[PDB]
Amino acid sequence: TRDTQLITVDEKLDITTITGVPEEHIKTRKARIFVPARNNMQSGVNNTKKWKMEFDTRERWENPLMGWASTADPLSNLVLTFSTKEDAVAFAEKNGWSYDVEERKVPKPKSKSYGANFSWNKRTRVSTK
Amino acid sequence: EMVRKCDPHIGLLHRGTEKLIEYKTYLQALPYFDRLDYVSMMCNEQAYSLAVEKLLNIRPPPRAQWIRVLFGEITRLLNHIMAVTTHALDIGAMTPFFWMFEE
Amino acid sequence: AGLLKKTTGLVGLAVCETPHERLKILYTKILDVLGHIPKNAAYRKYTEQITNEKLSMVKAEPDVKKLEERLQGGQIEEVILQAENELSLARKMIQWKPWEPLVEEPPASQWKWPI
Amino acid sequence: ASATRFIQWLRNWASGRDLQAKLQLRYQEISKRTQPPPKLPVGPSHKLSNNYYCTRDGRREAMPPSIVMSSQEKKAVSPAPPIKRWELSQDEPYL
Amino acid sequence: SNLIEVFVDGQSVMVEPGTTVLQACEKVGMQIPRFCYHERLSVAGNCRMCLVEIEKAPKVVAACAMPVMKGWNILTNSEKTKKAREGVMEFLLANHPLDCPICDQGGECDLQDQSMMFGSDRSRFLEGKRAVEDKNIGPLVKTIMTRCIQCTRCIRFASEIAGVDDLGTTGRGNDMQVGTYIEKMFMSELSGNIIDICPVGALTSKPYAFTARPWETRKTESIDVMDAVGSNIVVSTRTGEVMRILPRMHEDINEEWISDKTR
Amino acid sequence: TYKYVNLREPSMDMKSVTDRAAQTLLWTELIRGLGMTLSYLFREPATINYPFEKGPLSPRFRGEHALRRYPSGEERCIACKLCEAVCPAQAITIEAEPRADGSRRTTRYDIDMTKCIYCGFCQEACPVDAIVEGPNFEFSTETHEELLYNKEKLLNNGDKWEAEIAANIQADYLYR
Amino acid sequence: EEMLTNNRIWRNRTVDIGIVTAEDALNYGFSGVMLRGSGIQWDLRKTQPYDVYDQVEFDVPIGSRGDCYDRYLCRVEEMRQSIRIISQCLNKMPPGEIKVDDAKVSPPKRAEMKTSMESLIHHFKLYTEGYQVPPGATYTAIEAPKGEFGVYLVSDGSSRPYRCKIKAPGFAHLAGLDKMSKGHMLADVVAIIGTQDIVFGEVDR
Amino acid sequence: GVRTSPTGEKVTHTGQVYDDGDYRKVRFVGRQKEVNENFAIDLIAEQPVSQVGSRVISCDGGGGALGHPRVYINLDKETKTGTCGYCGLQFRQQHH
Amino acid sequence: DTRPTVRPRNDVAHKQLSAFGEYVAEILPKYVQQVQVSCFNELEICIHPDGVIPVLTFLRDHSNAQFKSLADLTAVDIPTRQNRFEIVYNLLSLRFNSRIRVKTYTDELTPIESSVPVYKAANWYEREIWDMFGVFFANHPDLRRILTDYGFEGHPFRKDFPLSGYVELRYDDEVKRVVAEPVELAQEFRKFDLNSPWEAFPAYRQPPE
Amino acid sequence: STSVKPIFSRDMNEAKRRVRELYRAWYREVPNTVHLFQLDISVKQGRDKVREMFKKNAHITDPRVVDLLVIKGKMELEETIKVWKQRTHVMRFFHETEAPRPKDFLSKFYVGHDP
Ligand SMILES: CCCCCCCCCCCCCCCCCC(=O)OC[C@H](COP(=O)([O-])OCC[N+](C)(C)C)OC(=O)CCCCCCCCCCCCCCCCC
Ligand SMILES: CCCCCCCCCCCCCCCCCC(=O)OC[C@H](COP(=O)(O)OCCN)OC(=O)CCCCCCCCCCCCCCCCC
Ligand code: SF4
Ligand code: SF4
Ligand code: SF4
Ligand code: SF4
Ligand code: FES
Ligand SMILES: [K+]
Ligand SMILES: [Zn+2]
Incomplete structure (x- = not known):
């Protein structure tokens, strides 16, 4: 079908030598693959649906002139979005980044009952409505 | 002075x-x-706005569409x-x- | 037949002295090349259909200006060039064999947007 | 506009036009730099009734692309009807 | 076995008896709007923002309180449902104050966001707005009660989670006021949590007041060391400075609460 | 509709051929070009006498930034940070804290005038007409550091140009 | 025109300089005056109108030689047609609002932003987060002064664009500078660059 | 109000000043420290408290659409005056 | 289509493009993987990477396509995909006053055949894709950086390339030339989390994971 | 799975030939580069730098990655031979203005927090 004369390459994919990233920011960084925690000030859950990859925080110092926050870390604002955990781990492995993976924390199903607010002999009865 | 190859x-x-x-945003x-295209400023804006409006599925009002054409053609004078x-x-x-840069 | 046009209006597109005779040649050559494509290929069925439609118009209208209004392809010199391109395409479809089944399906989520 | 009659004649003749009719320097024919205040109108959605947003929500009427074909004697067609030929201008066909 | 089939927009989902319409919609990825329902508090059913249409029924039902019945088709995006959310949001914003620039909740406010997604885009309220006097309840929680939407989350939290029955509702009708009535301090080891559950800027952090906006903070997911429980926290930083500490959900350690010392 | 710009056939009668012969030999169409530049020599130039005369501007002109006050002297800015969020160049840095009287006010309001693109989005987004772009445009400096405005510099600009700034907002706020 | 059109020195510098055939122009990606100078009848204002260009009347200039002189005549004649359109826009200007009356896309008026709760919320969100754009990708083009200017804008459902590819018409024109300079001198390449109407803000982006 | 630190440097309305040993004071040698002399905290305090007869008062900052978003201030408390969160003007209810 | 603020639909063009999409998929089943038409009437043909030259040649030469103009050619980087790159061809037909979009895919190491033989316009668009994404085009007449500086390392338009890069230039008086050094920013770019935690468009809700 | 389309070389043995061919081109070019650009380095320093660059990727075993490295290396060579690069671009391989950063744990400990 695919008449292209393919070859065989039985080694793990690795593109660290062709991505142009300096050695300092490959072997010393620590990627963090995680599903962002819900912002506790809001009840919305639309920002907890994709996996992110962020890097370890590094020093920020005050600019002597204006007091602005300065950085020497080129990857400080880098956030990558991935559809699944396996996709994120694949991207980190081929770039030569050491990574920590945190399994998604999903809310457990809860048994809600408006009627329990007015129980005859249980402590779920509320004193105010 | 004959040009044998141009390599911009x-x-x-x-x-x-x-x-x-x-x-x-x-x-x-x-x-x-x-x-x-910093000689055709309001024409570049219109192309971007037509694209976002197309994805937004909204329509600019009729008077805005006439201003955009009006300043679209003033801009064409600027560029030409x-x-x-x-x-x-x-x-x-x-x-x-x-003469024309006073216009 | 009509008077010969002095120019086509398109730079580099020379006027054709014999538009009808040249069109009959190119369409006939296309239908011969399409005979080497398998009978069920959609390219053959569609390309023969449209080629025959244009060939009939060329045979049923001796006036060039009136022929142009029927073919709806601009100047008659543009229609000849498109015939040359279609013929070149058919000669290449045989080598490619696009009528064969899909070479390879994409990965599971290749065309999924958003991600 | 302060040119003497002689210089106006000389410059009109040297160019072949009546320049005074169309001067490229502006004069009191321009608008006043102070203008009366406006009172701009309101849009079609400025209503107190029969104006629910779900009946004019453009963004929420957009849909995902409709899949025509997916790999997961019919007549031939073109992307659209062939373009109609332009007609020569009657205002000024030849420049 | 005991699961009952219900339909969300026609899609079938199998749920346990006693599951609410809101919870059934969660199993297909649809989040119903809410201001008073919290999954860790008792059901209240008084904001009406979760009203949703049930096919072949004329009255919209409260999604947070109505149990699903076998065979129901929940229409989470119908015209009747969408007009209910616009009517309720219109009532919520009628007396709400125009404090958004001066309000700490701006940018992370459920009333703001749900007003963009489910409410209308303009006002037709031509009257004067209500204004309530503030109520001091301690040095940690700032109180600006003109922004309150009478959702009673703080009332239910203080009574069920904290165990302190000091917050209530005094008044009636449009003059109903949340507070302590008497001049009292809501002092507890879990008191700071009413800032997070309050959907609006009526309850805010006093130490954090005016210092930052939500969108400019970086969220570093860390751990707490004030005690030995190990509560999971989020540390908000802004240009190399720690701005506040927020809870991070962990179902097995702290859920979405932290102690006041940790906060 | 289209038109041809250079599709014309010249006449071939002896009078038209001689007319073109006279044009070739006597440079008539080049003499005509001289006559057009001679006309300009006798028109009034369009130059203005800067800095004694200034090019016309409008109340919408977007110049140097300024922080305004209420008529009582209180700062209009209440540290909402809408300007900082909308600034395309991220030229605005803001910090805020409760003031000694409990007011929501800023402790830092910096605009890097070398990042700024003078677009006016900040004054559009300000809900209290606090940050505005004034009418000043003659504020070149001899050093880079002088273009990093802080809050004191912005309040001084507002107190300097308030008389003009207020009159320009009065002339254009109904269009906003 | 008195200075340039019939000037023999100007015609020497531009006639038969940088000839491009109609077939080559299409294949090299040219647009605008670069197509119309070779005799191709194409203009997006007439074939794919946008805004209210179908409510105005104007003529599209067409070249015959495909050289720098015909493209100069096309540009001078397009300036005349722009004045023709401006006359029609000054007379057909209608009354009404100037931005879409949907406050989840366009910000409300400042008077309403300071009086209405819904208007302040939308002003706040439209200037901090922006308006979310439904997912999807579009290619939208206009007849910009220099040619076909378009953007391939990709949205992912959020308030920030995912991808924004810009199609600068001069990028394709400049790519053709090597073909159009064949057989010419140094002074002619100076003329060919100017006929393509290149600005490197768009070519380089 | 504008006051000078012991070393002579002026203090801004935000309370900022350089310590006697801070090397950053070198930037002001041969130049001046820009300080706004109209402290807004003092000027607002000079405005009189407005007496009103209603339990609820509205402030738009004055000037209509040229002020700030209209907010409504509750004046039920007698111990303190209601203050506008936008512009700092104070209001008091007549005879409670 | 009487609503002032809503964009009217053109269902005549939607049918025509849908009909022609099937037409192409019937003629090139070896390469066509998916066809779709958007709600604003833009036809997309998604093909296998092997079909770049056959598909584009058919769309340029077939009498019922005549897409003689390559409007634009660009890449989009989607890291979560196994093939992270998405090569997009935007074609214009002057004969039929229509547009079509052809899309394929590739990764860091798999080449894609050069379309210079089909469209002379693709010469620089493929140089830009290589320069800005690192996608190699086989048999390109001359492939090299077009936009980035000489000696520039990396591909800026990849999603994992930092916004400010890794190096920056200044002038050093000791060596009397412009040098390149690791990037340090006086003010770090301030990352804003603008996404709202509430779903905006129910029509695009993906099935739960 | 594991069957991939090659770029230039079907195996490492074929790929290494292109590496050696590229090395010979760079080796013969350094004398010209040190001459045209008027660099104040020696032909030995330049050829040592070329060797340093090649040994930096001596651990690669994927032929495709090697093919891209040769492709990128040939682009670098083309930029240098045609003097598209300037003296500043050719001296960026030597980092003359970068102060030597610490390597041992103690030196890194004293100056900052980075690993
Ligand atoms: C009846 C008896 C029979 C014999 C009678 C004969 C009488 C007539 C005698 C012949 C008249 C010839 C006039 C001179 C012609 C020379 C010019 C020429 O060759 O034309 C063709 C040339 C070239 O014309 P061309 O470019 O169109 O090409 C001509 C040849 N073909 C068309 C075949 C290619 O024209 C020029 O010389 C251009 C001039 C250069 C631009 C100079 C700037 C203009 C300056 C204008 C001001 C001049 C002021 C001069 C006065 C100064 C006073 C001190
Ligand atoms: C009347 C003006 C007298 C004063 C002019 C003084 C300047 C002389 C230099 C300019 C040349 C003009 C003199 C030539 C004769 C012109 C009159 C003439 O030719 O008769 C008019 C007649 C009408 O022309 P028509 O019929 O419409 O079309 C031409 C068809 N042969 O045309 C004809 O049909 C007759 C045949 C035309 C062909 C004859 C060859 C003409 C060209 C020869 C070169 C003339 C110039 C030689 C001198 C050069 C130096 C200036
Ligand atoms: S609670 Fe929300 S809507 Fe109300 S003022 Fe504060 S930010 Fe605005
Ligand atoms: S103060 Fe907040 S949490 Fe309490 S009832 Fe009011 S809005 Fe709800
Ligand atoms: S004018 Fe524009 S770029 Fe300048 S500070 Fe204001 S928002 Fe930022
Ligand atoms: S200047 Fe205006 S927009 Fe900016 S922080 Fe101050 S009040 Fe907000
Ligand atoms: S969330 Fe159901 S009524 Fe409040
Ligand atoms: K809150
Ligand atoms: Zn006020």
Whole structure:
């Protein structure tokens, strides 16, 4: 079908030598693959649906002139979005980044009952409505 | 003086507009478009606005569409004055540049 | 037949002295090349259909201006060039064999947007 | 506009036009720099009734692309009807 | 076995008896709007923002309180449902104050966001707005009760989670006021949590007041060391400075609460 | 509709051929070009006498930034940070804290005038007409550091140009 | 025109300089005056109108030689047609609002922003977060002064664009500078650059 | 109000000043420290408290659409005056 | 289509493009993987990477396509995909006053055949894709950086390339030339989390994971 | 799975030939580069730098990655031979203005927090 004369390459994919990233920011960084925690000030859950990859925080110092926050870390604002955990781990492995993976924390199903607010002999009865 | 090969090297004004736009909101990205063809500013804005409106599935009101055409054609005068007179300036004719740049 | 046009209006597109005779040649050559494509290939069925439609118009209209209004392809010199391109395309479809089944399906989520 | 009659004649003749009719320098024919205040109108959605947003919500009427074909004697067609030929201008066909 | 089939927009989902319409919609990825329902508090059913249409029924039902019945088709995006959310949001914003620039909740406010997604885009309220006097309840929680939407989350939290029956509702009708009535301090080791559950800027952090906006903070997911429980926290930083500490959900350690010392 | 710009056939009668012969030999169409530049020599030039005369501007002109006050002297800015969020260039840095009287006010309001693109989005987004772009445009400096405005510099600009700034907002706020 | 059109020195510098065939122009990606100078009848204002260009009347200039002189005549004649359109826009200007009356896309008027709760919320969100754009990718083009200017804008459902590819018409034109300069001198390449109407803000982006 | 630190440097309305040993004071040698002399905290305090007869008062900052978003201030408390969160003007209810 | 603020639909063009999409998929089943038409009437043909030259040649030369103009050619980087790159061809037909979009895919190491033989316009668009994404085009007449500086390492338009890069230039008086050093920013770019935690568009809700 | 389309080389043995061919081109070019650009380095320093660059990727075993490295290396060579690069671009391989950063744990400990 695919008449292209393919070859065989039985080694793990690795593109660290062709991505142009300096050695300092490959072997010393620590990627963090995680599903962002819900912002506790809001009840919305639309920002907890994709996996992110962020890097370890590094020093920020005050600019002597204006007091602005300065950085020497080129990857400080880098956030990558991935559809699944396996996709994120694949991207980190081929770039030569050491990574920590945190399994998604999903809310457990809860048994809600408006009627329990007015129980005859249980402590779920509320004193105010 | 015969030209055997032309090899334009560009990127001496490459600033990463397309990568910077990815860090802006759709409104924050609009002023980038005045600075692409900086002789046809309001025409670049219109192309961007037509694209976002198309994805937004909204329609600008009739009076805005007439202003945009009106300033679309004033902008075409700005660009063609720049194009023709500088084209003539590089060919040795400098007087028309001054007459039309007062327009 | 009509008077010969002095120009086509398109730079580099020379006027054709014999538009009808040249069109009959190119369409006939196309239908011969399409005979080497398998009978069920959609390219053959569609390309023969449209080629026959244009060939009939060429045979049923001696006036060039009136022929142009029927073919709806601009100047008659543009229609000849498109015949030359279609013939070149058919000669290349045989080598490519696009009528064969899909070479390879994409990965599971290749065309899924958003991600 | 302060040119003497003689200089007006000389410059009109040297160019072949009546320049005074169309001067490229502006004069009191321009608008006043102070203008009366406006009172701009309101849009079609400025209503107190029969104006629910779900009946004019453009963004929420957009849909995902409709899949025509997916790999997961019929007549031939073109992307659209062939373009109609332009007609020569009657205002000024030849420049 | 005991699961009952219900339909969300026609899609079938199998749920346990006693599951609410809101919970059934969660199993298909649809989040119903809410202001008073919290999954860790008792059901209240008084904001009406979760009203949703049930096919073949004329009255919209409260999604947070109505149990699903076998065979129901929940229409989470119908015209009747969408007009209910616009009517309720219109009532919520009628007396709400125009404090958004001066309000700490701006940018992370459920009333703001759900007003963009489910409410209308303009006002037709031509009267004067209500204004309530503030109520001091301690040095940690700032109180600006003109922004309160009478959702009673703080009342239910203080009574069920904290165990302190000091917050209530005094008044009636449009003059109903949340507070302590008497001049009292809501002092507890869990008191700071009413800032997070309050959907609006009526309850805010006093130490954090005016210092930052939500969108400019970086969220570093860390751990707490004030005690030995190990509560999971989020540390908000802004240009190299710690701005506040927020809870991070962990179902097995702290859920979405942290102690006041940790906060 | 289209038109031809250079599709014309010249006449071939002896009078038209001689007319073109006279044009070739006597440079008639070049003499005509001289006559057009001679006309300009006798027109009034369009130059203005800067700095004694200034090019016309409008109340919408977007110049140097300024922080305004209420008529009582209180700062209009209440540290909402809408300007900082909408600034395309991220030229605005803001910090805020409760003031000694409990007011929501800023402790830092910096505009890097070398990042700014003078677009006016900040004054559009300000809900209290606090940050505005004034009418000043003649504020060149001899050093880079002088273009990093802080809050004191912005309040001084507002107190300097308030008389003009207020009159320009009065002339254009109904269009906003 | 008195200075340039019939000037023999100007015609020497531009006639038969940088000839491009109609077939080559299409394949090299040219647009605008670069196509119309070779005789191709194409203009997006008439074939794919946008805004209210179908409510105005104007003529599209067409070249015959495909050289720098026909493209100069096309540009000078397009300036005349722009005045023709401006006359029609000054007379057909209608009354009404100037931005879409949907406050989840366009910000409300400042008077309403300071009086209405819904208007302040939308002003706040439209200037901090922006308006979310439904997912999807579009290619939208206009007849810009220099040619076909378009953007391939990709949205992912959020308030920030995912991808924004810009199609600068001069990028394709400049790519053709090597073909159009064949057989010419140094002074002619100076003329060919100006006929393509290149600005490097768009070519380089 | 504008006051000078012991070393002579002026203090801004935000309370900022350089310590006697801070090397950053070198930037002001041969130049001046820009300080706004109209402290807004003092000027607002000079405005009189407005007496009103209603339990609820509205402030738009004055000037209509040229002020700030209209907010409504509750004046039920007698111990303190209601203050506008936008512009700092104070209101008091007549005879409670 | 009487609603002032809503964009009217053109269902005549939607049917025509849908009909022509099937037409192409019937003629090139070896390469066509998915066809779709958007709600604003833009036809997309998604093909296998092997079909770049056959598909584009058919769309340029077939009498019922005549897409003689390559409007634009660009890449989009989607890291979560196995093939992270998405090569997009935007074609214009002057004969039929229509537009079509052809899309394929590739990764860091798999080449894609150069379309210069089909469209002379693709010469620089493929240089830009290589320069800005690192996608190699086989048999390109001359492939090299077009936008980035000489000696520039990396591909800026990849999603994992930092916004400010890794190096920056200044002038050093000791060596009397412009040098390149690791990037340090006086003010770090301030990352804003603008996404709202509430779903905006129910029509695009993806099935739960 | 594991069957991939090659770029230039079907195996490492074929790929290494292109590496050696590229090395010979760079080796013969350094004398010209040190001459045209008027660099104040020696032909030995330049050829040592070329060796340093090649040994930096001596651990690669994927032929495709090697093919891209040769492709990128040939682009670098083309930029240098045609003097598209300037003296500043050719001296960026030597980092003359970068102060030597610490390597041992103690030196890194004293100056900052980075690993
Ligand atoms: C009846 C008896 C029979 C014999 C009678 C004969 C009488 C007539 C005698 C012949 C008249 C010839 C006039 C001179 C012609 C020379 C010019 C020429 O060759 O034309 C063709 C040339 C070239 O014309 P061309 O470019 O169109 O090409 C001509 C040849 N073909 C068309 C075949 C290619 O024209 C020029 O010389 C251009 C001039 C250069 C621009 C100079 C700037 C203009 C300056 C204008 C001001 C001049 C002021 C001069 C006065 C100064 C006073 C001190
Ligand atoms: C009347 C003006 C007298 C004063 C002019 C003084 C200047 C002389 C230099 C300019 C040349 C003009 C003199 C030539 C004769 C012109 C009159 C003439 O030719 O008769 C008019 C007649 C009408 O022309 P028509 O019929 O419409 O079309 C031409 C068809 N042969 O045309 C004809 O049909 C007759 C045949 C035309 C062909 C004859 C060859 C003409 C060209 C020869 C070169 C003339 C110039 C030689 C001198 C050069 C130096 C200036
Ligand atoms: S609670 Fe929300 S809507 Fe109300 S003022 Fe505060 S930010 Fe605005
Ligand atoms: S103060 Fe907040 S949590 Fe309590 S009832 Fe009011 S809005 Fe709800
Ligand atoms: S004018 Fe524009 S770029 Fe300048 S500070 Fe204001 S928002 Fe930022
Ligand atoms: S200047 Fe205006 S928009 Fe900016 S922080 Fe102050 S009040 Fe907000
Ligand atoms: S969330 Fe159901 S009524 Fe409040
Ligand atoms: K809150
Ligand atoms: Zn006020």
